[PDB]
Copies of this chain bind each other. A is one copy, B any other.
Amino acid sequence: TLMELRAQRQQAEAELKLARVTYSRQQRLAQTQAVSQQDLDNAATEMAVKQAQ
């Protein structure tokens, strides 16, 4: 069972990388006012979700 969770955590570890890189990749353009503040709220919150996971 511990091995099972040992892998299942490894999944979320990857998704957290995806959401985080996507977030910084949004903000770096967002200093030049990227695609509204809407997507920034669509990115920062997902990262909080992957963080909680």
Contact = CB atoms under 8 A, between A and B. Distances in A.
A26 to B, nearest CB: 11
Majority secondary structure of chain A interface residues (helix, strand, loop or mixed): helix
Nearest to A14: B48
Given A7-B52, A8-B52, A52-B7, A41 B22 contact: yes
This chain's copy number in the assembly: 3
B52 A10 contact: yes
Contact of A11 (B8, B25, B41, B49): B49
Which residue, A7, A14, A22, A38, has most C-beta atoms of chain B within 10 A? A14
Interface of A: 7-8, 10-11, 14-15, 17-18, 21-22, 25, 38, 41-42, 45, 48-49, 52-53
